[PDB]
Amino acid sequence: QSQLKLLVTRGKEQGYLTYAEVNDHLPEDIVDSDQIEDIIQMINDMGIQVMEEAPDADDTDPVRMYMREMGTVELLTREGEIDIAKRIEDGINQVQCSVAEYPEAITYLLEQYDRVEAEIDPELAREKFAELRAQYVVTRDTIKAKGRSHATAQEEILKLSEVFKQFRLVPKQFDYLVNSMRVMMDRVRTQERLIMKLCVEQCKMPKKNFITLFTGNETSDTWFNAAIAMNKPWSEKLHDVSEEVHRALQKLQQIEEETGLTIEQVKDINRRMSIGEAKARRAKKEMVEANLRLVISIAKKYTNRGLQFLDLIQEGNIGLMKAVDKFEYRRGYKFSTYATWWIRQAITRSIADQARTIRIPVHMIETINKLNRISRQMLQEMGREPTPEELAERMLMPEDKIRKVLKIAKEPISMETPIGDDEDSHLGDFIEDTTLELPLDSATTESLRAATHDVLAGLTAREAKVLRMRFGIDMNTDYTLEEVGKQFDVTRERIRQIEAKALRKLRHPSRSEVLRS
Amino acid sequence: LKAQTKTEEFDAIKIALASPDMIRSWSFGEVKKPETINYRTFKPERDGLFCARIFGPVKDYECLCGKYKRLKHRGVICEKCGVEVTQTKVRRERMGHIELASPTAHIWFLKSLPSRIGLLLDMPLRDIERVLYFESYVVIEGGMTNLERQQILTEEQYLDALEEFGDEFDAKMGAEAIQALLKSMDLEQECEQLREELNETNSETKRKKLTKRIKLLEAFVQSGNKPEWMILTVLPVLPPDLRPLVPLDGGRFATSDLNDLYRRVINRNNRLKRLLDLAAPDIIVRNEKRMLQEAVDALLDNGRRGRAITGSNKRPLKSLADMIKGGKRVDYSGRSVITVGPYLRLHQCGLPKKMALELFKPFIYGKLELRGLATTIKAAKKMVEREEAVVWDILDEVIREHPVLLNRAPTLHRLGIQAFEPVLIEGKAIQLHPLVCAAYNADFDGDQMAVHVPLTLEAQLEARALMMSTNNILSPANGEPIIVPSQDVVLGLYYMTRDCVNAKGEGMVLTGPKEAERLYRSGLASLHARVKVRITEYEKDANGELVAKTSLKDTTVGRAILWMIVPKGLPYSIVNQALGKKAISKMLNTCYRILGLKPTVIFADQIMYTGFAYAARSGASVGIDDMVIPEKKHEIISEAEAEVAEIQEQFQSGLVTAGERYNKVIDIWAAANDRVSKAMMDNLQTETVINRDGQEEKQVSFNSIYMMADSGARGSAAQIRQLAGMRGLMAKPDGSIIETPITANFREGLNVLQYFISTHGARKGLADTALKTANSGYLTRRLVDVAQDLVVTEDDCGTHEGIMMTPVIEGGDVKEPLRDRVLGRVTAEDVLKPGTADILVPRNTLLHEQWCDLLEENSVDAVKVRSVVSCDTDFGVCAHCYGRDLARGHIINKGEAIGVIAAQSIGEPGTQLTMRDITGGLPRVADLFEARRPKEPAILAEISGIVSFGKETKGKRRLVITPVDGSDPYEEMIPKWRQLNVFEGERVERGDVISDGPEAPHDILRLRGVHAVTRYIVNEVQDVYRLQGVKINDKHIEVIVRQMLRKATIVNAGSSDFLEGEQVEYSRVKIANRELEANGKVGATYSRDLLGITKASLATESFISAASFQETTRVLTEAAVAGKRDELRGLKENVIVGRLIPAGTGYAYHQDRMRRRAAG
C-alpha cells in the first residue's frame, strides 16, 4: 500500500531518476548498503513490466544477527556452573568405567606397554603397569575357574576396573581405544544387520518373528535351525541363506573370542559409554554456550589489527571451547578468569599468524611491536625524530637486524590503489613485466642459433661434433673431455687440442663477433 | 572422423552453470593454506594461493627445490616436490580449487535483481530466502501432512510441528537446505502442472505471472543445467599471475585484492572444517557458516552489502566481478604536434626523420640484413642505434609505398583516420595536407595527431584502398566533397576572379597560357577588366569522348590563367567566370561526377597550389582602417534611444502596458541593431569609385575584410557586424535580455560596464560548448550501440515498396524548397511521366539523371524510392535499397557497414547543435530517436467511424469519444484537460486528429503506418538540422529507423507464443516458412512496434555484445542460467574476442565460415 502506491505514482518517471527521494519514504533502519542496488535495478532498463516485478518481490548483517542468538542468555552462578561441571565429570567417569569394563582396552594397554619397554619415572611406570597386569592375571583366572559364580569373581573384575581407572591415559590413547570399541560394535551390528536383512527381507520372515527368535543367543546356530525347522512359509527361504547366516554367526562368535565377553552384553557396556558421551558433550556445550559473552567482551580489546571482529570472537569461541575441556568444579579457582586467558591466548595466537598476507613467526611479531613501543618515546622524550642508529642502540639487536625487520612490515600495498588519479589510475597498471623477453631479444637469439648452426658447417666432423659436444649445444646434456675422449679413442689433451683449433678458426668471421656486444 | 582434442578453431562460445565436478575438472590441486609467499626465502609455500606444485613454477624451467634445472626434464615432475617443470606462463593459466564444508550460495544467482534461485523456486529474496539460509527461520522440503512444501518455520513452530508428526517430513535450514530444495525440485513435472493449472478459467488477472514463469521454467530445464549447481560446494581458484604479489622497488610488495579475499575465505573455511570435528555448539558453528558465506560472497562480487574492507585501505576490495564490470594501447605507434605542409600532395604527409626511424625499426632491421651492410640482426640494431647515414637511405626504401594512417583526438566520423604515403622531413613535427585538415576538424593551435604503421600485408592494402585520403574525396554523410579548399586558398581563387574595371585593364586579347607571360611581365594588371581571350572548351555527349569548342569569351586575367588548372572535360570558363566562394567547391564536385577520381584529385592539388600562390601574391591584410564604421551610427543610436525614451515616458504616464514595455523597447533596439547592421554592410560592400575611361562608376569594395567574408575564409555577417556595427542585444545570466545593447563595437572602445555584460555571453558560450561537445558523443555511443551490427548483404533482393520521396516544403506558409533528396537513389518502379514511359524500375537516379528530372518540369515532384525502411531483406540490407552515397561514386559495395557510417555522420555534426512548441537542438534529436511520448500527447482515431460522446463524465471521467461504424465500438478517454477538434456526429477516418497537438510516433506507427512514422522521424529530425544549417543525408536517419523498428508483437496463434514480442527477423523468416510447410494456421500475424534507440539496443543476440555496454553482472548471469551460446556473427562481440570483422575486408571470411558451420 504505502510503499507501492508512493513509489509508482511518484515515479512517472521522475525525469532524471530522482534517487534521493523515495529512499527516505521507506521504513526500517536507514543508511544501509544493502537496499541500494534493489532500486537502481528496477527503474530503467526493463521499464513498465519491471515496475510490476518489483512489488511482487517486495510483498542483513552477520554480527547483529549473531548477538541475536547469543541474546539467549541462560547465564550461570557459582551454583549453576559447578552443577554443569559436575555433570561433565559425571559423564566422563561413566565413559572411563565403561571403557574399564572393556577387557581388551586393558589387555591392549598392557600389550602396548610391553611395546614401550621394548622401545615420568621408568620404575614408576614398571610399578603401576605391574599392578594392572597383576590384577588382570588374577582376575583372568577367576573367569574360567568359575569359582564364585561371577559374584565375588565379579568383585575382582570391578577391582581390576578401579585399577585401570587409576591410570591417567593420554587423549590420543583414550580416543583410539574408544574409537576401536565403536568400530568393533560397528562390525557387530554389521553382522546383526546382515542376518536381519537376509532373513527378514530376502526370506520373507516378519520382523516380529525375527525379534522373537534372534534376540536369544545371537551367536549359536540353535536359533537358525529352529527357525528353519519351524515349518513356516518363511522357513523354506532360509535354506537359500543358510551359508550367509552361518558365516555371520561364525564371525560374531569370532568377535566373542576377540573381546572375550558375553555378546549379550557388549551392547550394554557400549550403550552406557555412549550415554556418558552425550552427557559430557552436552554439558560442555552448555558451558561454552553460557560463557559465550566473555569471548566478545575480551575480543573487543583486540579488534582492528589485521583481522575482523567476526574472526576475533570466533577464535575466542574456540579459545573458550578448549578452556571448558580442562577444568574441574573441585577447584577453588572460578571459570570467569581461567577461560579469559585461554581466549586471550587463543585469538592472540591467531592475530599473530593469519593476519598479513606474508608469513611471519611469533618472535617476529613480538620484536616488531617492541620496536614501535620503544620508538613512540624517543621522539617524545627528546624533541626530534628517532634516529635508526640510536633506536637500535636502545635494543639488544645491533642495527642491520632492525633494518631487515622493517622490510617485513605492512601487508603491504595493493595494486588497485589509485595513484595519479587519472581515468583511472591503478598502481598495478604501471607494473612492467620482466619475465618476458623483448621480441628483439628473442629474434636475435633465433638468429644466433642460425649463426652457430651455420658456422659449425664450415668445420670438420671431428671438430664440429667436438665443439658442439663440449659446450653442449643441440644435444642438451653437455659432456666433458673424458666422455668425449672415450668416444673418440684419443683421450683428454688430444680432444682439447682440436677444441682449441676450432676456436682458432673463429678469428675472421664477423657474424658471431657482432653478435657478441 | 574428426573429433580433435586440441586447441583449434572455435565457431561459438557457450555459457552455463558449473557442476562441482565441472570445477574439479579445472582443478590442478586444492589450495589448503592461506599462506602466500615465504617471509624469509620469498618462496612459494606448499599448498597456498601461490603453490608451485598446484599452479606453475616461478622460474621458467627450473623446479621449486632445484633437483632439476635445464630443459632435461620438461615433461617429468620433481621427486621431492611435485612441480611440473614446463613454463612460467603455466602459472598464468592453471586453475585450482577449494572444497568447502557446508554448501555456500552464489551471490549472483542469489541477489541480482530477480532472485534466480528464488524465482525458479517461487520464493521471496531478501525476505524469506534470507531468514532461511542465515540460520533464522528453518524451511520445509515437502510434507505429506499439515505442512505444505515450502513454508517457513521458527524454532518453536519447528519443534511443535515435529512433536505432532516428525520423522517423515524432515526439512533442514540454511544453505544445504536450499540445496535439497533446488535438488528436490522437479522442473519436468512442474512444467506440466504449471501448464495445466495456469490455463484453467483465468482472464488477464493471472496470465502475467503465468506466462512469465512457465517460459522461465521451460528455459532452464532445456538449458541443460541442474539447479544443484546454483549454490556451489566447490569454488574454483583464479590463476596466480592474474593476481600476483610482485616486489616493487626496494621491497614493498604489490598484490591484488583477490589474495586478501582468497586468504579470508580459506581461513574462514578451515575454521569451519575444524569446528566440524571438535565440539560443535550450534551457535558457534552456524555463525562460522554465515561467515564463510560472507567471505565467499565478498570474493565473487562485493557490491552490494556493506563491502568487505580491510587491507588497511579505507577503500573497498576489488572482487572478481568488479574486475570485469563497466584503453587498448598498441605497438608500432607514435604521435606529435601537427603542422601545415603546402608543398605536399593530397596522398602525402610529413613524417619526421627520428620518428619514422624508430617506427619502422623492425622493417629497417630486416631490409638491412637483407641487402648486406649488417652481418646479422643485432648488427642492424647497433647500426640504427648509431644512425649511420646509409641507414637513412634504407629508411627511404622501406617507407616508399608503405602507407601510414593518421588520427586526431576527437574521432567523430570515418574521416578521423586517413592513410598517407610517408615523406621524410628533417624535423620533430608531423606535417599534414591542408585540404584534409578540415575533415579532421583540426587546427594548428597546437593540436597533435597520432600515427599507425600497417604491419600486415593486406593491412597495408586496407590502408591504401580504403583509408587512403585519395579515396575519401566525398563526405560519407552528405555527397558533397570533404577535402574542399578552405580559408587561405579560397580567398586566393576569389582574388583570381573579382572583375575590376580598367586600371591597367583594356581588352588586349590572346590565347590562354600566353596571358601568363602577360601577368608576370607586368604592364597589365590582373583583376581587369574585363578582357577577352580564346577559350578552347571541351565537352562530351552521347558517345562521350571529347568535343572541342574554340571561342572568344570575356573573362579576366585571373580567369584566363586559372583556366590552365581546369581538367580536360568540364563546361570551362563559366566555372571560373563566377568567383571563389561556395561554387569553389561546386566546381570540384561537378568535376568528380563528370571525370572520375584521379582527374579530380590532381585538380585539387592544383587548385590548392593556385590559391596559396596567388593569395600570397595578393597580400590581403587587415589594418585598423579596414573595418569602417557607418557615419549614421551615432545618428541611428540616438534615434533608437529617442524612440525608447518616448516609450519610457509613456510608461511614466500610464498609457501603454508597462508590464511588457520591456518587449517593445527591445524591438526598438533590435530594429536599431538591424539598421546599423544594414548600413554598415551596404557601405562596406560597394563603396569605391575607380575611374573607368571617363571616370565615375561603382563595383564592390576591395576592403580585405569584405573579400574574406565574400569568400568563406571565416568571415560571417554577425562577426563583421560586431567589428564595425555594434554588438546587439546581450543576454543576462537570468536568461533575460538587457534593454541597453552594446552600442559600441570592437573597432571602437568598450566600456568596463558593457564588457562585464558581454563576459556572460562568452562564459555561457564556452561552457555550453563544453556540455554539447560531450553530449554529442554521448548520443553517438547510443546510435552505434544499436546499429553497428547490420551490413549490406544478400546483394539485391526483390520488392518495390518504399517511401514516396517529395521535396521538403515549408512553403505552405513560408516558402522553402529542397528537392535534391533523391539522387544515387534506386527507383522503386517506373515512376510515371506526364505522358508515358521514362523512368525504369531499378534504375538508380544518377547525378546527371536527377538533373534530367528538371526536364520533366516542376510537374513531377513525387517519386517512390527503395529505402532501408522497407526492403524485404532478412538480417541485412539490400544494396539497391540503400543508394551509393560514399566518398565513392557508385552504389555501396556489398558487405560494407552501413550502421557505423550512418551513426558517425549523424553524431558528427552534434558539435554544432544548440540545446534549447519547439524544443530544438541536440536534445530534440534525442527525443525523436528515443521515441518518447510528449508532455501533452494528441489523440487519433484508431478505426474510422461516427464521433459521439460516450457518457459525459461517467466514471471516473472525464469526456469520452466513441467512433463506431460498420462493426464494433471504441471508447477513448479524454481527461477534460485540453479541448477537442471534432463535434459529435461527425465521421472520422482511420487515424484522424482529435486533439490538434503534438503527435506520438508510437500511435503513428501503430495506426497511421510505418512509412508515416519513418517519414515523421526523418522530416522532424532533419528540421532541427535545417535551423543549425547542417547538411546530412536522409538515408542514415532511415538506417537507424530500420532497426529502430527491429522487433514487433504477434497477435493471433502460431509456432511463436502470442504475447511474446519478437523481432520481424525470425518472424518473417518463420512466416514465410509456414505458408508452405504444413499450414499457415500454425502461425499468426505480427505487428510492428516502435522502440527507442536504447530499448532496441538493449535487445541483441550475442551475450558477449550485451556485456559490453549494459550491466555485465546482469547479462552474464541471466545468459548463464539458460545454456546460451554466441555463434558468432556480431561486430562488437567479434572484436573483443579479437578476430576478423564480419564485414568489409572480412565478410567473405565469415560467409565461408558461416556456410562451413552447416555440417554440424
Ligand SMILES: [Mg+2]
Ligand atoms: Mg584546435
Ligand SMILES: [Zn+2]
Ligand atoms: Zn625439484
Ligand SMILES: [Zn+2]
Ligand atoms: Zn532490398
